[PDB]
Design a protein around this ligand. Structure first.
Ligand SMILES: C[C@]12CCC(=O)C=C1CC[C@@H]1[C@@H]2CC[C@]2(C)C(=O)CC[C@@H]12
Ligand SMILES: C[C@]12CCC(=O)C=C1CC[C@@H]1[C@@H]2CC[C@]2(C)C(=O)CC[C@@H]12
Ligand SMILES: N[C@H](CCC(=O)N[C@@H](CS)C(=O)NCC(=O)O)C(=O)O
Ligand SMILES: N[C@H](CCC(=O)N[C@@H](CS)C(=O)NCC(=O)O)C(=O)O
Lengths: 219, 219
């Protein structure tokens, strides 16, 4: 079983949970609860750049979110079939990560800057990201972003669609094909199960989650 | 020939210049000098997420730095021999990208916070990043970071050592093997040519370029 080292929360680990769970892969989680827990992982040599996410998989102590996601996608056949499909999948997922980063860091914005950030997220979602992925689905008319087949790109996008819905559920309103994709993916037995109660899926960060992470990571 | 669409400066495009050059690949550049130039690329449907870097390669219009790098690396066999070597390469280059990001965004720092950021970059270089990579070279005693063969990891790291050197030339002084890798890689015929005066290699950003970039990208 791959073992995921992180705090008990979404942060940067969440896409990894999604992708493993979607690929039907059973995993264990070792929850970092304090500066001491992280401290031990640092002193053991387990963390190349002394940071997490870290995942023990196939003899490796893999750090860096993109390194872990790339490996998992390749291992479990969710990374297309060739170099051109990987280019499409990389381009798509990098775009999704850019929007993810904005949403991710929102709790760090001061009360006076928060409203401007939220408005920028909404506007970019509507004019930059959602148009781009709707255009790819519209252009080829297929059920999946790339190669008419389930990839890490579809899995990354649907997780994102759920975070956007948490923010503002009307953002997806003028994107029929994105709506249809979210539904399609959500019904896949592995995704459906991940979205059910009691799965390793993590909740949105709240006030105390930010307090707790600050005392673990020192930011 | 690939064509690289960017302003005339390092920014995010520079590692793609380094990688293409190191692979022995001649490329052209189309320099964005105004906001109207950038606007035309956007309006013509050329930028998937309305942004550069964009690279025309083998007919395709690839955006997203990491997508472009992955493609070029796969194509020219600088991405290791298998899934596990790609995992090491991904992990190593993501760590270098983190340090690179700090250096890259330094000119954006408000005057009151810039000194704190410089000392942070220096401290992390010496205790986080350089020791990590000195350790990899220690782990196998070979002349390349991964798989005993030139990869995109060697090329990304050597570019990074050159920037660290532009910041503070003493930072690498306690890292024998990194010094040696910098010399070896710099003497590879393709990289030696790229490092020659008058090549596509770009200057460090100065105040003028920051002003010029602001007019173009409106950040
Ligand atoms: C990305 C981040 C900041 C930079 C850093 O060093 C490490 C973290 C991990 C915890 C994140 C945090 C951002 C804010 C988050 C999402 C919360 O509100 C709860 C957990 C927390
Ligand atoms: C990466 C960047 C910021 C985010 C953004 O929106 C657009 C750019 C492009 C120009 C970069 C700049 C960062 C600072 C740079 C390196 C300079 O000092 C000269 C040019 C400039
Ligand atoms: N490049 C990022 C690094 C993320 C990161 O900065 N990790 C945080 C938690 S999400 C951490 O362990 N920070 C502690 C530290 O910097 O010492 C990745 O995808 O892994
Ligand atoms: N995720 C980045 C996105 C690139 C990016 O932020 N592009 C900048 C220039 S370096 C830009 O076009 N800025 C204007 C904008 O975001 O609209 C990448 O790796 O390419």
């Amino acid at each position: 079983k791959p073992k995921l080292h992180y705090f008990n929360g979404r942060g940067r680990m969440e896409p990894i949970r999604w992708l493993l769970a979607a690929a039907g892969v059973e995993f264990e989680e070792k929850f970092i609860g304090s500066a001491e827990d992280l401290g031990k992982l640092r002193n053991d040599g387990s963390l190349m750049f002394q940071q997490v996410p870290m995942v023990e998989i196939d003899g490796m102590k893999l750090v860096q979110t993109r390194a872990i996601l790339n490996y998992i996608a390749s291992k479990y056949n969710l990374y297309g079939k060739d170099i051109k499909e990987r280019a499409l999948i990389d381009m798509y997922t990098e775009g999704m990560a850019d929007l993810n980063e904005m949403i991710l860091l929102l709790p760090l914005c001061r009360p006076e800057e928060k409203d401007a950030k939220i408005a920028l997220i909404k506007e970019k979602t509507k004019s930059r990201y959602f148009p781009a992925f709707e255009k790819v689905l519209q252009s080829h008319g297929q059920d999946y972003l790339v190669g008419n087949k389930l990839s890490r790109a579809d899995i990354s996008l649907v997780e994102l669609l759920y975070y956007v819905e948490e923010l503002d559920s009307s953002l997806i309103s003028n994107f029929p094909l994105l709506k249809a994709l979210k539904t399609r993916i959500s019904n896949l037995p592995t995704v459906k199960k991940f979205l059910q109660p009691g799965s390793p899926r993590k909740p949105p960060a709240d006030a105390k989650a930010l307090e707790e992470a600050r005392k673990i990571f020192r930011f």
